[PDB]
């Protein structure tokens, strides 16, 4: 419900 991923590689 609250998980946030660094999805786009551009965000290191």
């Amino acid at each position, epitope marked *: *419900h*609250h998980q*946030k991923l*660094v*999805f*786009f*590689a*551009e965000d290191v």
Partner: antibody, heavy 112, light 113 residues
């Protein structure tokens, strides 16, 4: 609770203008890239515009480049899509997306 | 742009049987940190796309054990060990290693009868 609520959709005349807004919450908005993705009925997922953390840098496919502008407000935590010179093929459901999350989408209908 | 192409694009599955979907990228999806940003989406009928599997094999929240992912470089596979009625919809593979963010055509999974 990650949240992405879009607004600003509806009916637009050909060549007119429409502005999409996306309200984001539940995470540190300023740290992630965001995109607008659209979809025609019975069609695949089409990227409309991307923008990085600070924005910064943007991307537009030739489909909308020069007519569409994507922008970002890291205070309000809002994502915007400025749609100018709208034509018939712009008719679709538009999604505010973070890659790992998708909003419910808002419908844009270009018709006179 | 990184071309993502899936196979098959239409997948009728007899209830109780498993399912496989191929996905190939025109270039390697291995980023400079060793991670591979290849993902899978499921878009149930009349709904928004939802992240199913991220970075090749990692299940997102709520995703049951029957869904699994594997693959490396430019070749990737999504497996459903046993298709349930709830798994009906369109599956997209997607890469976020390169800009622009790109999607596959989408594979519509239906109930075979």
């Amino acid at each position: 609770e990650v949240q992405l609520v879009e607004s600003g959709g509806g009916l637009v005349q050909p060549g007119g203008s429409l502005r999409l807004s996306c309200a984001a919450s539940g995470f540190t908005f300023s740290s992630y890239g965001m995109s607008w993705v659209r979809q025609a009925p019975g069609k695949g997922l089409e990227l409309v515009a991307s923008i990085n953390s600070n924005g910064g840098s943007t991307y537009y496919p030739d489909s909308v480049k020069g007519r569409f502008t994507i922008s970002r407000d890291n205070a309000k935590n809002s994502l915007y899509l400025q749609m100018n010179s709208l034509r018939a093929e712009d008719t679709a459901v538009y999604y505010c997306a973070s890659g790992d999350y998708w909003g419910q989408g808002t419908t844009v209908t270009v018709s006179s | 742009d990184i071309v993502m192409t899936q196979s098959p694009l239409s997948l009728p599955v007899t209830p109780g049987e498993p399912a496989s979907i191929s996905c190939r990228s025109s270039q390697s999806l291995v980023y400079s940190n060793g991670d591979t940003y290849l993902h899978w989406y499921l878009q149930k009928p009349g709904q928004s796309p939802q992240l199913l599997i991220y970075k090749v094999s990692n299940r997102f929240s709520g995703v049951p054990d029957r869904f699994s992912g594997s693959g490396s470089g430019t070749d990737f596979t999504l497996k459903i060990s046993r298709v349930e009625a709830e798994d009906v919809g369109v599956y997209y593979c997607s890469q976020s290693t390169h800009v622009p963010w790109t999607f596959g055509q989408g594979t519509k999974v239906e109930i075979k009868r």
